[PDB]
Structures are given as C-alpha cells and as structure tokens.
C-alpha cells in the first residue's frame, strides 16, 4: 500500500479508502475493477529488495498510523506507531509466508523449526491432488477416502483452494498417557473408528509397457504365452 | 504441487542463512532441511 498525507500528515493515510474496497468487493461478487486498477490509480505499488532499502513500511494499516492516542492482557505486546514519516503499509503480514507455511494454524505461536518441519511434511500428506485423478494414468497416485476441510483455517487457505482439496481429516484427539502404548512418539488410534472409514485411502499404480523398441525382426508381441518353446 | 511450482534454487558468503532482505519475498519457514537446507527456497 502507498501511504499518503491528507488534509494533514495526521491523518496521514493509506491512499486506498473504503470506497475502493467497496468497488473491489462489488467486482468480486459480480459473479470491472481489478487489481490492475489499483495499480493504475497508484494506491498499491510494486517494491523490490533494492528499493526496500529506502522506504519505511508500516505493519498494520490503522494502528500504525491513526494518530497518537485498558489493554487485554492476553493480547501480545505490539510496540507502537512510534514514527510518522511512513511511506508504505504492508498489505497483510501473513503474506510473508510461502505456500506450505500458510497451511499451519497459528504459526506465530510455534517454534520456528516446527514450522519448517511442517512445511516439509505437508508435501507428503495424502489427499486429493486433482479432481480428475481417475482419468490421469500416472504412477503412484494416493487419494484419501473422505477428506475434510480443517476446522482451524487461515485466511490464505482460501486462495490455495485448500478447503476444496483438503489433505487430512479432523480426528478427535486426546492427549493422555493411556496405556504406555503410545509414548516416545506416537500413538493409539481407535480401531472401530478406522472401521468406520477413518483415514482410509486409495492407491493407484500404473505399469507401462510397449512393443519392441529395436530389432527389425526382433519384434516383441503382446499375447498369452504357453510352452511353445517359450 | 503448488509449492513445487514456486520453488527456487541456488547452486553451490553465508548463503544458507536467512537474510533480512528475504523478508516478504521468500518464505521464512519452508526449506528442505538436509543438505539443501537454505539453498532451495520458496516464494
């Protein structure tokens, strides 16, 4: 976003205002005024690493530049506005994450290595990878039986179409030392619940083969062989 | 798949580090720890 002054550097401001938001939403729901339009009107701006060296971004639109002005203790400790001459405001901080990281709920409460591990694992999860799997003929396809969208989502997962191609299920987990059969990681899974279909999955494997590659007369043929000096 | 299409490589200076300038351009989290940790990146 592009910070600006207005009647005052007070009351300095994002150029973009609720009117533009309205127009955007309208275009969104029309299913006329697209991001490119934001570009042309110069409310938003492309910034690269070099130019970044000479700007002053604000994290959150409002609180970072309302003015200089009782707090919920549970809320984290935000610093302040503390400065005036901003020039840009971040669109939304959660966008520093990549794709894989955007799956994680509350990744701001985790210890970073954990985030990295998840980012790696998420590419192993079974789940529907494409809506037409039954037509593709490729090696090694794994399809979940009854995927489910997660209950705890993040906004970004909407843009990854995740909640339409989810890659797991919501288990009723219980954290407990039950019979020591689940320590030093994992765990106990309800057998009956499995029978109900939990975490079932389909596996498809494709075998390819063709007739002779070579040999003018060496010509491999498909048929049912017998003891014909075979 | 999506992640794959936005991956990024570096051949071969502390290139495995996470430099500040990566802010907002490269995922601070996702990277194939292992030999390639820090080299392969994602947008």
């Amino acid at each position: 976003f592009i910070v600006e002054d207005d009647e005052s550097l007070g009351h300095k401001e994002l150029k973009v205002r609720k009117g533009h938001i309205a127009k955007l939403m309208a275009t969104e729901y029309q299913d006329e005024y697209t991001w490119s339009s934001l570009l042309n009107e110069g409310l938003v701006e492309y910034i690269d690493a070099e130019e970044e060296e000479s700007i002053l971004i604000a994290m959150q639109p409002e609180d970072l530049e309302p003015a200089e002005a009782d707090v919920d203790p549970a809320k984290r400790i935000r610093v302040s506005h503390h400065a005036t001459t901003f020039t840009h405001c971040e669109i939304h901080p959660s966008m520093i994450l990549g794709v894989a990281a955007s799956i994680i709920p509350f990744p701001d409460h985790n210890q970073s290595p954990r985030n990295t591990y998840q980012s790696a694992m998420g590419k192993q999860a079974m789940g529907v990878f494409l809506t037409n799997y039954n037509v593709r003929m490729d090696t090694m396809a794994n399809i979940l039986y009854y995927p489910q969208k997660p209950l705890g989502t993040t906004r970004a997962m909407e843009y990854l179409k995740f909640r339409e191609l989810p890659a797991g299920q919501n288990a009723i987990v219980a954290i407990a030392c039950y019979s020591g059969y689940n320590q030093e990681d994992s765990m106990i899974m309800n057998q009956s619940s499995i029978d109900r279909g939990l975490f079932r999955s389909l596996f498809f494997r494709s075998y390819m083969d063709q007739e002779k590659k070579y040999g003018m007369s060496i010509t491999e043929t498909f048929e049912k062989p017998q003891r014909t000096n075979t | 798949t999506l992640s794959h299409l936005r991956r990024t490589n570096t051949p071969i200076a502390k290139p495995r580090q996470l430099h500040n300038t990566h802010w907002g351009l490269v995922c601070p989290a996702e990277t194939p720890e292992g030999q390639a940790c820090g080299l392969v990146k994602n947008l």
């Binding site: 401001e13 938001i21 991001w35 934001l38 938003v44 959150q60 639109p61 409002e62 794709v99 | 299409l5």
Partner: peptide
C-alpha cells in the same frame, strides 16, 4: 463514507483482487 480509512480487515479484499488477476503461478506463465 467512502473516503474513510481502512481497517486491517479490509486488506483481504485487496488480496483477493490479487490472485484473481494473477493466479498463483503467475511468474511461470509471465
């Protein structure tokens, strides 16, 4: 009003404007 400022919530609209005219593999195609 329409010139009114923006709440942090609004930004998700903007985001959705992006990703509509970009897609997620924009750079490969471009």
């Amino acid at each position: 009003d329409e010139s009114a400022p923006i709440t942090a919530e609004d930004s998700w609209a903007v985001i959705s404007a992006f990703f509509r005219e970009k897609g997620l593999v924009s750079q490969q195609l471009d």
